Coordinates of C-alpha atoms in Angstrom, one line a residue:
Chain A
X27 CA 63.2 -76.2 38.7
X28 CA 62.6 -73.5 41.3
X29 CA 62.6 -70.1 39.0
X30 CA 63.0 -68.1 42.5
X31 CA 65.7 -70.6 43.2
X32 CA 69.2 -69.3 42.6
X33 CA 67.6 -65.6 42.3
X34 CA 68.1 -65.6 45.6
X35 CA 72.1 -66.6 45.2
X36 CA 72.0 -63.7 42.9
X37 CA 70.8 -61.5 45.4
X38 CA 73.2 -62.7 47.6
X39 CA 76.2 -62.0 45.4
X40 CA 74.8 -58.2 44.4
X41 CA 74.3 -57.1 48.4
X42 CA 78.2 -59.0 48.9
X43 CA 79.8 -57.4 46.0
X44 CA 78.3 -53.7 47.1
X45 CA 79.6 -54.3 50.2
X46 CA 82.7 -55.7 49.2
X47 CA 83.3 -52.2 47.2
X48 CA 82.6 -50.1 49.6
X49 CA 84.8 -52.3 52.5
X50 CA 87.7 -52.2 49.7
X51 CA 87.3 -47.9 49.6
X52 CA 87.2 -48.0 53.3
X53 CA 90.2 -50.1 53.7
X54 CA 92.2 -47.9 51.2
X55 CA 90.8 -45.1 53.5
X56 CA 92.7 -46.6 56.4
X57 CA 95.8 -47.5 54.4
X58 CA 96.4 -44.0 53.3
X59 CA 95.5 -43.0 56.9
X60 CA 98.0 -45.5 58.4
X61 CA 100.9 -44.3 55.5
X62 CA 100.4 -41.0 56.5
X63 CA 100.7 -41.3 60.2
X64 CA 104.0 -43.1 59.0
X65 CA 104.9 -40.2 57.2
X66 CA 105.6 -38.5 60.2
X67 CA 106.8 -40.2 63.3
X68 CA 107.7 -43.1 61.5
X69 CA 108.9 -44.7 64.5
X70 CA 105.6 -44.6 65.9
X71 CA 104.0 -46.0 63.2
X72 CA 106.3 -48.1 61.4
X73 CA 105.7 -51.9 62.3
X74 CA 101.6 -51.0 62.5
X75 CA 102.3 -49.7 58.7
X76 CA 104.2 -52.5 57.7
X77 CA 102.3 -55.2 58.7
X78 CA 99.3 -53.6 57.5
X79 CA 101.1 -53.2 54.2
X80 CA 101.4 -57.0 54.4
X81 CA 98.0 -57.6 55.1
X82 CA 97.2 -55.5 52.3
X83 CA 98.8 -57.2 49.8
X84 CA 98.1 -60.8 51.1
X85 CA 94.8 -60.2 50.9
X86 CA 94.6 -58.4 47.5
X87 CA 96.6 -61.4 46.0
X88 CA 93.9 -63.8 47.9
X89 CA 90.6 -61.2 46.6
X90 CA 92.4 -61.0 43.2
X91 CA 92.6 -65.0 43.0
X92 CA 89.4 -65.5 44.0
X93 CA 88.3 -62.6 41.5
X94 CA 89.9 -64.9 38.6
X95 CA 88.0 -67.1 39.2
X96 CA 84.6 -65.5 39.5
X97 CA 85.7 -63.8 36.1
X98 CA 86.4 -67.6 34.4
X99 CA 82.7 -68.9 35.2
X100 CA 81.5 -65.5 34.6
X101 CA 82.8 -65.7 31.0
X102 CA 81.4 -69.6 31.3
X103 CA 77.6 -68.7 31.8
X104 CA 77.7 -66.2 29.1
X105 CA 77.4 -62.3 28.3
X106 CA 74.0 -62.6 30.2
X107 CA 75.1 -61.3 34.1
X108 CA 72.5 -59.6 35.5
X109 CA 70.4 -62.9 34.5
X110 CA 70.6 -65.8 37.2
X111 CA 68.5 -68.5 36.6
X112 CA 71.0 -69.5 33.7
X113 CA 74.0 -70.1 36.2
X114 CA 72.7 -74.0 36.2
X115 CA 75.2 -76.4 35.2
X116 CA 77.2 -77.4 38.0
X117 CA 80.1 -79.1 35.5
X118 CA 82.8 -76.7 34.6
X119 CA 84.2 -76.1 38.2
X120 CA 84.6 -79.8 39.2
X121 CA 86.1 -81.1 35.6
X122 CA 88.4 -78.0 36.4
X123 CA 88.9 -78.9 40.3
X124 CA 89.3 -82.5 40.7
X125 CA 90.1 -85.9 38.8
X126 CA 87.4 -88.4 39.7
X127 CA 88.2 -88.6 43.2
X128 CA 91.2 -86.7 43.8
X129 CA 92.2 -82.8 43.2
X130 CA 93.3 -81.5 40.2
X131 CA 96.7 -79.4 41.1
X132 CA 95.0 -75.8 40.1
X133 CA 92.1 -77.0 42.9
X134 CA 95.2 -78.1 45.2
X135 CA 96.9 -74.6 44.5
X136 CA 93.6 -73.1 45.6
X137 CA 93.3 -74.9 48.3
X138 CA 96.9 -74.5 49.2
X139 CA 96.5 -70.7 48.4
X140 CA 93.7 -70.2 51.0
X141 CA 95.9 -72.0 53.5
X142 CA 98.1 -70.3 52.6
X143 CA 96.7 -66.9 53.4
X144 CA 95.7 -68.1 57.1
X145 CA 98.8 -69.7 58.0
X146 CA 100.9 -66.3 56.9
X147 CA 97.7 -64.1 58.6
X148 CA 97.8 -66.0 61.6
X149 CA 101.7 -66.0 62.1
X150 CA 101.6 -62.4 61.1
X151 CA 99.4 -61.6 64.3
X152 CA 101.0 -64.0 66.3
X153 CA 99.0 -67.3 66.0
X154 CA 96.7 -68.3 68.6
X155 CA 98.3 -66.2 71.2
X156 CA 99.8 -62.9 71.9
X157 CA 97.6 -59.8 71.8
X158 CA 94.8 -60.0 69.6
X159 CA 94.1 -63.6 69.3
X160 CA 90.6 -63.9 69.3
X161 CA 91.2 -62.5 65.6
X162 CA 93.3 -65.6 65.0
X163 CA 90.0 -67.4 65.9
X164 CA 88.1 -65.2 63.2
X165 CA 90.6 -66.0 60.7
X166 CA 90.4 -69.7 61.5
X167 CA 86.8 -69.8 61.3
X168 CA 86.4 -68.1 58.0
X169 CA 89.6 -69.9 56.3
X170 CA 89.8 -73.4 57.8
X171 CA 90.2 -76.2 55.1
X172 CA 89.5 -79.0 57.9
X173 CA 88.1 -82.0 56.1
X174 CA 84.5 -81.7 57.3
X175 CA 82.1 -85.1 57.7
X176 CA 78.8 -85.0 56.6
X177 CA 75.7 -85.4 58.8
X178 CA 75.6 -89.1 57.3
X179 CA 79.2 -89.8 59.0
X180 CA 81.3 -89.4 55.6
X181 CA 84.2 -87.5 55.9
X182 CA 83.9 -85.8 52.7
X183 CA 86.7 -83.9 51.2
X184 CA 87.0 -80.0 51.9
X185 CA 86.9 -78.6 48.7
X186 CA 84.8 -81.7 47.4
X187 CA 82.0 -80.7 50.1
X188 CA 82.5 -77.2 49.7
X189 CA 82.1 -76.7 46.0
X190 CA 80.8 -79.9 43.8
X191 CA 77.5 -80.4 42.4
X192 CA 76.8 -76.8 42.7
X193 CA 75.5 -74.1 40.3
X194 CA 77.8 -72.0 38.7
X195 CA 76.0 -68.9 40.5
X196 CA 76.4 -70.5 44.0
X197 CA 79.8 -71.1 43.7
X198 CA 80.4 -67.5 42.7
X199 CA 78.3 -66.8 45.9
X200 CA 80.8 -68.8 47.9
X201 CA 83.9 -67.3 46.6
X202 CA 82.4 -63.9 46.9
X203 CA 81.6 -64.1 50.5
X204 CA 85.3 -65.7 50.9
X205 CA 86.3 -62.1 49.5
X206 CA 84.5 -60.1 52.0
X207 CA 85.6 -62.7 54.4
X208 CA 89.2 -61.0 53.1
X209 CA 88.0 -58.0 53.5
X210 CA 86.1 -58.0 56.9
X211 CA 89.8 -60.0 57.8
X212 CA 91.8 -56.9 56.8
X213 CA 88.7 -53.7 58.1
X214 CA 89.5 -56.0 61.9
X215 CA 93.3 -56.4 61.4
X216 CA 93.5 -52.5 60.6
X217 CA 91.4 -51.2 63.4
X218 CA 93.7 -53.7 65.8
X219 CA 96.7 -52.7 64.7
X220 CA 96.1 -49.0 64.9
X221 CA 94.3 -49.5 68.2
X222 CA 97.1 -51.1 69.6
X223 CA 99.0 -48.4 68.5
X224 CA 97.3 -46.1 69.9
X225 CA 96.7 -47.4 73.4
X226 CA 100.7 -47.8 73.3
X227 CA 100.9 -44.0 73.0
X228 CA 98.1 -43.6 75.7
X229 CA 99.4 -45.9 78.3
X230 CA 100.1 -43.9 81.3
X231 CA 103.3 -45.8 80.8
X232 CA 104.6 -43.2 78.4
X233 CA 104.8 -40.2 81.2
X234 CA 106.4 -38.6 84.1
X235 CA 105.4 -36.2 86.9
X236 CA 107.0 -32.8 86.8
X237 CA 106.8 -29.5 89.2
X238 CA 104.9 -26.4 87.1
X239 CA 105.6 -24.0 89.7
X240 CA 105.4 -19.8 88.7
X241 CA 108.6 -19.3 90.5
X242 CA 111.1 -21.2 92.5
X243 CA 112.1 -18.2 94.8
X244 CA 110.0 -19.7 98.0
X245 CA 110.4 -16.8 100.7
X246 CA 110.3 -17.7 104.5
X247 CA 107.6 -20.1 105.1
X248 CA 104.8 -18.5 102.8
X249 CA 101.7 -21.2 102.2
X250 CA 103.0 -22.7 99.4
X251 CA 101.7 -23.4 95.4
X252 CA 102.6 -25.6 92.8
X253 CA 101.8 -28.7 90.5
X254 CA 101.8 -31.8 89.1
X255 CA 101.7 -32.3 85.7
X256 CA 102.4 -35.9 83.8
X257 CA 105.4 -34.6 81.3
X258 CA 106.1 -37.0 78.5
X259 CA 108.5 -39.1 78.5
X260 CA 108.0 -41.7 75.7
X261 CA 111.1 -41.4 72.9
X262 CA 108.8 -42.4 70.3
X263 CA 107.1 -38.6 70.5
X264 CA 109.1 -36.5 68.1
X265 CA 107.8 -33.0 66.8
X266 CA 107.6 -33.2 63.4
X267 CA 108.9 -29.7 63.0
X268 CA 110.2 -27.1 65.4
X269 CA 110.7 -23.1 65.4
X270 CA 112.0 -22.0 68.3
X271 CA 112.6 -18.2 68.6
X272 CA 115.0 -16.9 71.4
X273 CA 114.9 -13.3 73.2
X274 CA 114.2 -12.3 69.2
X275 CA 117.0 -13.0 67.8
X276 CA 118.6 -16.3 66.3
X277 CA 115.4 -18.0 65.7
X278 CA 116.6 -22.0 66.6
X279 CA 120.3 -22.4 65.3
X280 CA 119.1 -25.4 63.7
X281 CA 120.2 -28.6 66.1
X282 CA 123.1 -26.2 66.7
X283 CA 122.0 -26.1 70.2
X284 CA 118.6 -28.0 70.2
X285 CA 118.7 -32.2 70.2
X286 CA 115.5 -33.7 70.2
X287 CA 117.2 -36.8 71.1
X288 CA 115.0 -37.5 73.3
X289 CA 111.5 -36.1 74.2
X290 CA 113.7 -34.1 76.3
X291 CA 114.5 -31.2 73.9
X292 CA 117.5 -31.0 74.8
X293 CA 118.4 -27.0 74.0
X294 CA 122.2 -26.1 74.3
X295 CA 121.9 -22.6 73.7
X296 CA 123.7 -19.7 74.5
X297 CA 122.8 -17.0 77.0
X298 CA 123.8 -13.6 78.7
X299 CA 121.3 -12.7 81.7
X300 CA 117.7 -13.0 81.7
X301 CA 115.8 -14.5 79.1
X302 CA 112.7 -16.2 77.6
X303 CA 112.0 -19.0 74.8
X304 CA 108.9 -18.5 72.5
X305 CA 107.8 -20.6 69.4
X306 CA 105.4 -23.6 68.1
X307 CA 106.2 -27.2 68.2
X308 CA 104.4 -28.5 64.7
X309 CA 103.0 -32.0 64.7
X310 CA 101.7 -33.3 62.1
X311 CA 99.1 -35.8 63.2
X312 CA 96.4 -37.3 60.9
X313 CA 97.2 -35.0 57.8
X314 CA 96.8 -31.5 59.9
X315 CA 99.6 -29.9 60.8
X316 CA 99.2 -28.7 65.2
X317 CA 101.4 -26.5 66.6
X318 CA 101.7 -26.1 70.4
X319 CA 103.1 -23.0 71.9
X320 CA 106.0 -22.5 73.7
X321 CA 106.4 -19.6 76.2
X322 CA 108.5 -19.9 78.9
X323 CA 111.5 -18.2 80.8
X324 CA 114.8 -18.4 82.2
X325 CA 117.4 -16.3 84.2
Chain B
X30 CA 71.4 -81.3 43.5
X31 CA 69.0 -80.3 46.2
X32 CA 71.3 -76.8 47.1
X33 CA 72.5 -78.0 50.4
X34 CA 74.9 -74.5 50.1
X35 CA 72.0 -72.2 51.4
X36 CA 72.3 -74.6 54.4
X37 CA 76.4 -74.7 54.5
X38 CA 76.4 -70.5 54.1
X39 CA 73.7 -70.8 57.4
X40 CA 75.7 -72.7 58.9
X41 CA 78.9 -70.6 58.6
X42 CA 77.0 -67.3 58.8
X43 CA 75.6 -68.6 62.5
X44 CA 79.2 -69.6 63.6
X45 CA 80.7 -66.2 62.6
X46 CA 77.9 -64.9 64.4
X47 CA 78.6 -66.2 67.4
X48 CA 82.3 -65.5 67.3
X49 CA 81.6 -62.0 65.9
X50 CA 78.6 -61.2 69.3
X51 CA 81.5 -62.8 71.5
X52 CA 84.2 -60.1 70.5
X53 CA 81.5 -57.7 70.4
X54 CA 80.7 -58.3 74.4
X55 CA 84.3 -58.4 75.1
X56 CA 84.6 -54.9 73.4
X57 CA 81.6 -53.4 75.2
X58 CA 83.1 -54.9 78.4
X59 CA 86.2 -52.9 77.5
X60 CA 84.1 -49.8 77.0
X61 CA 82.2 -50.2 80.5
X62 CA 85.5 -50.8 82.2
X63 CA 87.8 -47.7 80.6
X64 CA 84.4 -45.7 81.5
X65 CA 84.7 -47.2 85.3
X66 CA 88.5 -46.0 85.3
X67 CA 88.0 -42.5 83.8
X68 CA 84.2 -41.9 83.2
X69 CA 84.6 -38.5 81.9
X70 CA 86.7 -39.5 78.6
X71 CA 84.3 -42.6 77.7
X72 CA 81.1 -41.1 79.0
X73 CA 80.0 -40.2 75.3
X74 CA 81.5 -43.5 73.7
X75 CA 80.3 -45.6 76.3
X76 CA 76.7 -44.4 76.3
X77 CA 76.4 -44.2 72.7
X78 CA 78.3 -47.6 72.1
X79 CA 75.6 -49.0 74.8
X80 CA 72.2 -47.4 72.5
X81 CA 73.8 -49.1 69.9
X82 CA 74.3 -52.1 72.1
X83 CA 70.2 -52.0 72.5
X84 CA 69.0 -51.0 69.2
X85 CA 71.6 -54.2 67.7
X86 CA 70.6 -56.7 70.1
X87 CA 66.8 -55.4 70.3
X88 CA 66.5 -55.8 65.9
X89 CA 69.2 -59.1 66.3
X90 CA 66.3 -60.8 68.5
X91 CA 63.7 -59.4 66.1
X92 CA 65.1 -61.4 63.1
X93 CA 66.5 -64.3 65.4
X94 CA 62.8 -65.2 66.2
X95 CA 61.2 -64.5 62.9
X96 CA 64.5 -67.7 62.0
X97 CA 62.8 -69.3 65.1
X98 CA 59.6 -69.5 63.8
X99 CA 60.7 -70.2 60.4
X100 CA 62.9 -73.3 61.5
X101 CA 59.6 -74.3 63.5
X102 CA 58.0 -75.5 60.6
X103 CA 60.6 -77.4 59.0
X104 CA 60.2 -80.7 60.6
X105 CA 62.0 -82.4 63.9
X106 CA 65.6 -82.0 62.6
X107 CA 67.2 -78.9 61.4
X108 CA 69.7 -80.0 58.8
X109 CA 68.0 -82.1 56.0
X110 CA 68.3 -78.7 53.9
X111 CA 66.8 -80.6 51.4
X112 CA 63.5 -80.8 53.5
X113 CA 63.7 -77.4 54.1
X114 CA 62.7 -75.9 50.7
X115 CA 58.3 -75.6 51.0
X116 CA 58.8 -72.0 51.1
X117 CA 54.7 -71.7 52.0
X118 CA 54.2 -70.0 55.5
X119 CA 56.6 -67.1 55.4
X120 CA 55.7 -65.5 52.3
X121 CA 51.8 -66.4 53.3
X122 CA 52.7 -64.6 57.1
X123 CA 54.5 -61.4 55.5
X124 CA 51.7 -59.9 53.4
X125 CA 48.4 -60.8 51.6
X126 CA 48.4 -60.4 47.4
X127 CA 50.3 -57.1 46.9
X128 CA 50.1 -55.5 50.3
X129 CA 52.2 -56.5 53.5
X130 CA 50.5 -57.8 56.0
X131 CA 50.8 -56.2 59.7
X132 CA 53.6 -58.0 60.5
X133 CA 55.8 -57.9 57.6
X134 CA 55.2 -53.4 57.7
X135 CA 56.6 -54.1 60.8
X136 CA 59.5 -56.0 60.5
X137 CA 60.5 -53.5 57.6
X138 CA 59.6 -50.8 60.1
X139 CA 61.7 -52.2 62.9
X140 CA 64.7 -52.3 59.9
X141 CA 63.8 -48.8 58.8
X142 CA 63.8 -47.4 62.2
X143 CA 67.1 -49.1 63.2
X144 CA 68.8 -47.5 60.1
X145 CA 67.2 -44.2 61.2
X146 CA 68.0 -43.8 64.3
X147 CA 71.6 -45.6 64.1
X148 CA 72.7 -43.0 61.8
X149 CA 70.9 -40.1 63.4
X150 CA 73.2 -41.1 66.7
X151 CA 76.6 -41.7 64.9
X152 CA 76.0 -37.6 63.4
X153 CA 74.4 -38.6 60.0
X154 CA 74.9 -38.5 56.6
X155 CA 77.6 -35.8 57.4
X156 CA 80.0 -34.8 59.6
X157 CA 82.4 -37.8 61.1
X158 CA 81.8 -41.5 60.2
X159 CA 80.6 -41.1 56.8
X160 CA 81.5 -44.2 55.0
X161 CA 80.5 -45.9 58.1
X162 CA 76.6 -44.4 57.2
X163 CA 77.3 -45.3 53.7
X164 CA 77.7 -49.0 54.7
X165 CA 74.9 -49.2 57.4
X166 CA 72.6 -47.5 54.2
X167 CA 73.8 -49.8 52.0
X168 CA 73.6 -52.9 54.1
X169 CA 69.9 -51.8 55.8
X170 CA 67.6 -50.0 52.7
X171 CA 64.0 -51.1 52.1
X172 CA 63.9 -48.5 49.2
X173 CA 61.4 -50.2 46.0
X174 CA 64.4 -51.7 43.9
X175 CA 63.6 -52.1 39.6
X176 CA 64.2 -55.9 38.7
X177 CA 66.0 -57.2 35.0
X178 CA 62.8 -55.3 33.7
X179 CA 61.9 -51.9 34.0
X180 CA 59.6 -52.9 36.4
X181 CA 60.0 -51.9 41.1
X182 CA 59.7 -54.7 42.9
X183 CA 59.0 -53.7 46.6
X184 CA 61.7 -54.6 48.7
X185 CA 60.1 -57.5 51.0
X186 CA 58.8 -58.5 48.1
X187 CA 61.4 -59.6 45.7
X188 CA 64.2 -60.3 49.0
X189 CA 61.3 -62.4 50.4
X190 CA 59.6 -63.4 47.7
X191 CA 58.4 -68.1 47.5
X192 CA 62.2 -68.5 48.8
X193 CA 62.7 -71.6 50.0
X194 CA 62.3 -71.3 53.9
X195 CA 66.5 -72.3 54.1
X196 CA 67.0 -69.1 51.7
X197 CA 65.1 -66.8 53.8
X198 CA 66.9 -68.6 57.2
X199 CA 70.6 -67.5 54.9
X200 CA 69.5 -64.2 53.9
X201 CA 68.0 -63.2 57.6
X202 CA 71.5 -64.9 59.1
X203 CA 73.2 -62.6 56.4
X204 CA 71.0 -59.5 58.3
X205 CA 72.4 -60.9 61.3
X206 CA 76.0 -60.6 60.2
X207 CA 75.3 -57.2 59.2
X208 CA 74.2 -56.2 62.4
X209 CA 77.6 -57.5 64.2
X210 CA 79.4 -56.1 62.1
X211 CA 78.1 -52.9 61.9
X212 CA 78.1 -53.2 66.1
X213 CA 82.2 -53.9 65.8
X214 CA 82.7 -50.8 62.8
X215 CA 80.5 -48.6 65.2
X216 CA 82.6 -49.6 68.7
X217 CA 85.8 -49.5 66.9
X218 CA 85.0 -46.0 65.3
X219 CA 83.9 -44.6 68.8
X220 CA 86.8 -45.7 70.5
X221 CA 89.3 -45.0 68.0
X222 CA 87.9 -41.2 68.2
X223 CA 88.0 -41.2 71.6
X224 CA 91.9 -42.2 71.4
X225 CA 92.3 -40.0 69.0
X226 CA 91.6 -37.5 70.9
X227 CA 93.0 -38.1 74.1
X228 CA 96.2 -38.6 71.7
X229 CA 95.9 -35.0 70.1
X230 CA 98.3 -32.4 70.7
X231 CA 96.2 -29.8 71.4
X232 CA 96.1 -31.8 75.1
X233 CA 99.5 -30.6 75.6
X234 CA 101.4 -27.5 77.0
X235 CA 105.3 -27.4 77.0
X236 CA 107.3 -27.3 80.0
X237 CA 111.1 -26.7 80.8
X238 CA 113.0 -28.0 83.7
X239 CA 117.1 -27.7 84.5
X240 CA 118.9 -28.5 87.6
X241 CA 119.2 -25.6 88.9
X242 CA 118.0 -22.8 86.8
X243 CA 119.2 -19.0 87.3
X244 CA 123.0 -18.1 85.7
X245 CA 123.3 -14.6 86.9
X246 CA 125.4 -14.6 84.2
X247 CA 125.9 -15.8 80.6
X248 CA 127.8 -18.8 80.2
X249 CA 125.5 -21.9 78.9
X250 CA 122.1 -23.3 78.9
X251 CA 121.3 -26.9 79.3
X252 CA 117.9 -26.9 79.2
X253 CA 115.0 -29.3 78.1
X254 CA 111.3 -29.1 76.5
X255 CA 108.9 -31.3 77.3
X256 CA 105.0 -31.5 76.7
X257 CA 103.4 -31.9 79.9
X258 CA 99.4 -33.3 79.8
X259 CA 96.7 -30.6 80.1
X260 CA 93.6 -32.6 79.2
X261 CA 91.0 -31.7 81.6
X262 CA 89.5 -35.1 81.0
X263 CA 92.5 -37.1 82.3
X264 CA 92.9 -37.5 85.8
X265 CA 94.3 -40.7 88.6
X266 CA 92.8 -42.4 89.9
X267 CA 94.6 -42.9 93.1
X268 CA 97.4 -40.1 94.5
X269 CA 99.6 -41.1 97.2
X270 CA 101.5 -38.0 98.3
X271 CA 103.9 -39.4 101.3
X272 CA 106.3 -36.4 100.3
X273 CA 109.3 -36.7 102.8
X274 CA 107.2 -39.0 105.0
X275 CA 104.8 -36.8 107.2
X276 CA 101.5 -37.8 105.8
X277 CA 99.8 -37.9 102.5
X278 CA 99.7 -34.3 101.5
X279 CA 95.9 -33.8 103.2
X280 CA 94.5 -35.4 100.7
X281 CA 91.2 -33.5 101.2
X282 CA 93.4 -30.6 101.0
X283 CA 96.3 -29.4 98.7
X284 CA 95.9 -31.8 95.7
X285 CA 93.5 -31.1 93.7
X286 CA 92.2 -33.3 91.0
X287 CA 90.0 -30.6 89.5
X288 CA 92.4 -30.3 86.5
X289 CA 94.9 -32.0 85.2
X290 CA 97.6 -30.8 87.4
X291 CA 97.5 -31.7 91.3
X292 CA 97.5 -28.0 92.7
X293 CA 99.8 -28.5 95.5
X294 CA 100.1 -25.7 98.2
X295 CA 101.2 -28.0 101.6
X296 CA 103.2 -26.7 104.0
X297 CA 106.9 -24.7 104.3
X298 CA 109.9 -25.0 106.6
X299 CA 112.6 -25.4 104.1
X300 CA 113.9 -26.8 101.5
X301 CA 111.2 -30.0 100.4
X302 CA 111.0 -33.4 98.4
X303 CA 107.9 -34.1 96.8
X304 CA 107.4 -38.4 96.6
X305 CA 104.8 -40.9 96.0
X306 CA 102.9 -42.3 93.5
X307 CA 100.2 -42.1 90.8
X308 CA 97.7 -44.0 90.1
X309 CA 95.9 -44.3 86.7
X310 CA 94.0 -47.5 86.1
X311 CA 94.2 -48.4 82.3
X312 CA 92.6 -51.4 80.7
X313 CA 92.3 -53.2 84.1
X314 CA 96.0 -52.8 84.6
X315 CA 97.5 -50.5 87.5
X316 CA 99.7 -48.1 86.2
X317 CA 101.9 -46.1 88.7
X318 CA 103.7 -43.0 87.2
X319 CA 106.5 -42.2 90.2
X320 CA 106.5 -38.5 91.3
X321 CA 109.7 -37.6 93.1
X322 CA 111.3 -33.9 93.1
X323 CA 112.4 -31.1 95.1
X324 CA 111.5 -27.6 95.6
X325 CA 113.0 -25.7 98.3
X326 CA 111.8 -22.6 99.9
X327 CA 113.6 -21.0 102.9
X328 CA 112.1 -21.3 105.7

């Protein structure tokens, strides 16, 4: 039997599992980045979080399934790991998968269970169609439990196909790139979700022109100067904190007067002649806190 | 029996490949087109996403025809996995007793150098995209790796080491894989910077506006706040200025594109209304922000 034979499966399985570690840190990375752009302006953020969230914990359940297994034929070949050309038996999995001809119900919950991942995935983006649906294709292609037929014309059964008569090790091999199928699944699903996100905050949609003029009092016919600046309008915008400091005094009578009920900071304060309205606008985006200026004046 | 599942894992890895290179062209194509709407924001993202674009494709057609010559010997069809298992003429055309021969230096050259200069263009080790070097390290490393001895294999060595030919095909379509999807990490990390940065608050200024302004006197104030768009970088694409319907504002003349704002100095006999429409072409589509106000001078 071919001594270089099923080395290379172990190979295989080291390179996925490395990589599989370092896409699971990454895609905590991105969690806690997408949880803390929910933390502030939730409303921005909230249906990217929580289908994200959902991806998540499909996914972990899948990976954490799959896991279980890899751990049962793991304790099968023995306390030897790092050792491959043992993983040659081929037996276990199929007693434990089907009966004779037909599925055993644990091999039919596995089955089911990667359905049903896709078919939740998939109606999660929005299958097939929508934004983002060449994803759905992805997802199809990785997960699809199509009963396949052989090159000699037999339809042979998915699983069946996909898993008997094979070494313990290449099994493992199989489910462990199914895992960083998960995971590739849920690095894509977070980078689409935040993009879209994020090109729904840039969309030129979101603004409005205004006039930035330094004065209004426009004498007889004088050449004249001014500008065109695209204000914000988008509700979904919300300063995560505000100071607002008057003619120095009264430092922002807290929504006493201002109403950030829309963009439009609304600000219902007081007055007595001429005046001007100072202070910082804090946002909090991506876990550092911004603040932008305010200096302006009024009669 | 005969390990058909290197030839099932080809299979898969090649059809994921495809899909992945497809979403990959669709992604550069949105990269050229943003950079054809506003050349100045993608300029950076779009030239580095297109070296990446070269080096990927450049190492992908490397290792695609090194699987070319491979599957050559394997007889007239291309699926009897089985068949494909004499694992003679690859090992023979890499290297000669312990030494590589001058091909195999250079294929681990051409690997070597692609992981060199990929990381040395997305900042390195340090700075930004970290993990993202820690997984294009991790995938591509030809560092002398110690087997279940104490012993270094060299790394074309034991990866390539009397493999049957279908192994070698699965572990170069594996190489592949890693190159796409280190090609969609790398594009959606560049334009995911890129949007977070046009989304940053330090692009903003505030602004006020009211209906009429001046009080002489103290009675109320209902004012509003908004953060008007002072990236340099942003800018419309078209600018139709028919303000009370003379003409289009000289569009040679007053409106000026060089920053953000449109420095508008036209004409004065009285008072004026500014209307007409901007045009900022996003993702293909057409947006048109609406610009209609007043300012009145007398004349």
């Amino acid at each position: 039997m071919g001594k270089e034979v099923l080395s290379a499966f172990g190979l295989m399985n080291e390179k996925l599992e490395a990589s599989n570690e370092k896409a699971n840190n990454a895609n905590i990375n991105a969690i806690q980045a997408l949880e803390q752009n929910n933390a502030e302006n939730p409303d921005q953020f909230a249906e990217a979080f929580q289908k994200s969230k959902k991806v998540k914990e499909l996914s972990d359940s899948f990976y954490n399934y799959i896991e279980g297994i890899k751990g049962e034929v793991m304790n099968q070949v023995g306390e030897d790991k790092k050792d491959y050309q043992v993983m040659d038996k081929s037996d276990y999995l199929d007693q434990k998968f089907f009966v004779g001809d037909n599925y055993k119900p644990e091999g039919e919950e596995f089955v089911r269970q990667i359905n049903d991942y896709k078919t939740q995935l998939v109606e999660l983006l929005g299958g097939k169609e929508g934004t983002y649906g060449e994803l759905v294709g992805k997802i199809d292609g990785n997960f699809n439990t199509n009963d396949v037929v052989d090159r000699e014309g037999v339809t042979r059964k998915w699983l069946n196909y996909n898993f008997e008569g094979f070494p313990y090790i290449a099994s493992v091999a199989k489910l462990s790139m199914m895992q960083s199928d998960i995971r590739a699944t849920e690095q894509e699903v977070y980078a689409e979700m935040l993009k879209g996100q994020l090109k729904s905050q840039i969309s030129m949609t979101n603004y409005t022109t205004l006039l930035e003029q330094s004065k209004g009092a426009y004498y007889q016919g004088e050449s004249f100067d001014g500008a065109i600046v695209l204000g914000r309008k988008d509700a979904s915008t919300r300063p995560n904190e505000v100071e607002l400091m008057l003619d120095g005094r009264k430092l922002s009578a807290s929504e006493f007067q201002i109403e950030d009920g829309k963009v439009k900071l609304k600000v219902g304060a007081g007055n007595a002649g001429e005046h001007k309205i100072t202070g910082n606008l804090y946002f909090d985006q991506d876990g550092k806190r911004i603040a932008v200026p305010v200096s302006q004046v009024f009669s």
